[PDB]
Amino acid sequence: GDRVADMIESRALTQALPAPTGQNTQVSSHRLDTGEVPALQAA
Amino acid sequence: SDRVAQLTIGNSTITTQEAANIIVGYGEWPSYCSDDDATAVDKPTRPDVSVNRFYTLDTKLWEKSSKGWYWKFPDVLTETGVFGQNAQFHYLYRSGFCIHVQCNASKFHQGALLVAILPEYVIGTVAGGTGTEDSHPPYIQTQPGADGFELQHPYVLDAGIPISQLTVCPHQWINLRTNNCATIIVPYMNTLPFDSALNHCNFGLLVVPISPLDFDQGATPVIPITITLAPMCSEFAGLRQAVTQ
Ligand SMILES: *[C@@H]1O[C@H](CO)[C@@H](O[C@@H]2O[C@H](CO)[C@@H](O[C@@H]3O[C@H](CO[C@H]4O[C@H](CO[C@H]5O[C@H](CO)[C@@H](O)[C@H](O)[C@@H]5O[C@H]5O[C@H](CO)[C@@H](O)[C@H](O)[C@@H]5O)[C@@H](O)[C@H](O[C@H]5O[C@H](CO)[C@@H](O)[C@H](O)[C@@H]5O[C@H]5O[C@H](CO)[C@@H](O)[C@H](O)[C@@H]5O)[C@@H]4O)[C@@H](O)[C@H](O[C@H]4O[C@H](CO)[C@@H](O)[C@H](O)[C@@H]4O[C@H]4O[C@H](CO)[C@@H](O)[C@H](O)[C@@H]4O[C@H]4O[C@H](CO)[C@@H](O)[C@H](O)[C@@H]4O)[C@@H]3O)[C@H](O)[C@H]2NC(C)=O)[C@H](O)[C@H]1NC(C)=O
């Protein structure tokens, strides 16, 4: 019993994945690449 | 078809035309570490030619009253060549070995040797003689290097184990009426898949004359024993600066 639109319009970010063992280490090679840097983080 | 052989690996080959046969230690060849077994997460180096060579190390003269010798592997090759340079830079290490010991003599000399392997050949002492003082062996009896070391009491192999049942471990005989060399191919035996090359010595090469040398006077009295070994399927990991010991 209202005509207002204010009242009629009036949650986790993380998913628990199953992890029985520690994760594997896939094969990497060298990389000589600008633009993207995986070391420099922002603490 | 068995007396004559040729072992080429790396850039070095050895020919033999009075061999016995090649025995493969515990029935399997040396191989690389699978990804089911490896725990180190850095990519190993595998030189594949420069370290898989027959390194001829030393020459022991065998007279009529010898006892026996032993060489701790791989500490015979941590002072030699590109194996000795990669094993001093890298912390981890694994390899097999193709071990070839030559001892030629005429068709009038006699005598037999028991060149045998045994893994984790730990060395005891004489315990102060009477057996009451806990004496530990020195570093040179423990790890003699490429110079080798002569057994004091070869009946008990300096470890309280008899040489009469050394023949369980991978071995073959050099009796001078039949053969002149003895190839023993040894895989990598250790619990953990890589280990340090400077601390842990995986096995020892016991070379003991059981039946003594004998020859009438007039023949050549100098009968040498030279051992040549080849690290097969060697790989290293964990690069840092050079340690020597
Ligand atoms: C002071 O004082 C002091 C005191 O005296 C002194 O001291 C001294 O010193 C000196 C110097 O050094 C001396 O002398 C010397 O000596 C030496 C030693 O001897 C000893 O030893 C031996 C050993 O043996 C061994 O081997 C054998 C074989 O060979 C065997 O058999 C045995 O068994 C043994 O084995 C062992 O060991 C080994 C090692 O390697 C091991 O491996 C194993 O395992 C085992 O264990 C011995 O033998 C001897 O013995 C003797 O004695 C006895 C008694 O008991 C008898 O029985 C015997 O027989 C003997 O005797 C003999 O011999 C000797 C020689 O040896 C003579 O001399 C006599 O006479 C008789 O004949 C002993 O114990 C030595 O070696 C030396 O020698 C050398 O030199 C000389 C001069 O100098 C001459 O003459 C000779 O000939 C020789 O030469 C040679 O060598 C060299 C080096 O090595 C070379 O290089 C050359 O080349 C030559 O070679 C040649 O020849 C030969 C023949 O011989 C032939 O074979 C080859 O092939 C070639 O050709 C010297 O003499 C001393 O000793 C000391 N002392 C004492 C007491 O000892 C000091 O000096 C002072 N100071 C000053 C300053 O002066």
Side-chain angles (χ1 to χ4, degrees):
Chain A
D2 55 354
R3 294 289 182 267
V4 302
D6 176 72
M7 296 198 291
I8 56 97
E9 65 94 26
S10 180
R11 181 177 181 170
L13 280 80
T14 62
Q15 183 67 255
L17 272 297
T21 62
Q23 74 176 359
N24 303 320
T25 302
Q26 293 87 16
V27 176
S28 178
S29 65
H30 67 89
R31 52 98 52 82
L32 278 301
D33 195 2
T34 58
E36 58 187 3
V37 45
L40 272 295
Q41 295 293 318
Chain B
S1 178
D2 196 1
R3 303 291 293 273
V4 53
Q6 180 183 1
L7 300 178
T8 171
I9 191 162
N11 56 3
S12 69
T13 183
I14 50 100
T15 68
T16 177
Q17 62 185 1
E18 201 168 0
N21 194 355
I22 301 166
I23 62 102
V24 181
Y26 302 101
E28 69 184 7
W29 290 85
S31 64
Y32 285 154
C33 185
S34 65
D35 291 333
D36 294 328
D37 298 333
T39 59
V41 295
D42 52 351
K43 188 185 286 184
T45 180
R46 296 178 182 93
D48 200 8
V49 169
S50 66
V51 296
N52 305 122
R53 300 175 69 253
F54 283 100
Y55 296 105
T56 302
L57 291 180
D58 55 351
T59 300
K60 295 292 187 182
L61 301 181
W62 172 41
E63 66 268 10
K64 293 183 181 180
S65 66
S66 294
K67 297 290 178 68
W69 302 271
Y70 66 96
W71 291 267
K72 291 294 186 69
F73 292 181
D75 205 2
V76 301
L77 293 177
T78 61
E79 294 174 355
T80 298
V82 194
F83 194 87
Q85 294 300 320
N86 282 114
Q88 288 181 357
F89 285 145
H90 293 88
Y91 166 60
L92 297 176
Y93 157 70
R94 76 188 300 276
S95 71
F97 285 94
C98 180
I99 301 160
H100 191 78
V101 42
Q102 302 94 12
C103 178
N104 56 354
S106 174
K107 298 168 74 66
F108 285 168
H109 295 81
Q110 76 179 4
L113 287 77
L114 181 63
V115 43
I117 220 69
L118 62 80
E120 302 294 332
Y121 174 51
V122 70
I123 292 295
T125 189
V126 294
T130 183
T132 186
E133 187 176 3
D134 187 77
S135 66
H136 297 282
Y139 180 74
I140 61 171
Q141 184 183 5
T142 291
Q143 289 174 355
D147 184 1
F149 193 79
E150 190 181 7
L151 288 173
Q152 293 295 292
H153 298 93
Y155 186 77
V156 297
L157 293 178
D158 295 336
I161 57 170
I163 196 169
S164 64
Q165 52 196 355
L166 182 65
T167 319
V168 176
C169 293
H171 72 287
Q172 70 174 338
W173 298 82
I174 301 169
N175 46 358
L176 303 174
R177 76 187 302 272
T178 297
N179 54 357
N180 301 123
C181 63
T183 301
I184 299 167
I185 289 173
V186 181
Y188 180 76
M189 64 277 294
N190 196 359
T191 65
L192 65 156
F194 289 90
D195 57 351
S196 177
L198 276 305
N199 302 117
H200 188 194
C201 296
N202 295 114
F203 50 91
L205 181 67
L206 295 174
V207 175
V208 176
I210 289 175
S211 178
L213 187 71
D214 193 0
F215 54 91
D216 285 330
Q217 179 178 358
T220 301
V222 175
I223 306 299
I225 297 168
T226 67
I227 60 102
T228 70
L229 84 166
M232 294 193 288
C233 291
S234 65
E235 60 185 359
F236 301 97
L239 182 65
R240 75 279 190 273
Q241 72 269 14
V243 301
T244 60
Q245 186 173 355

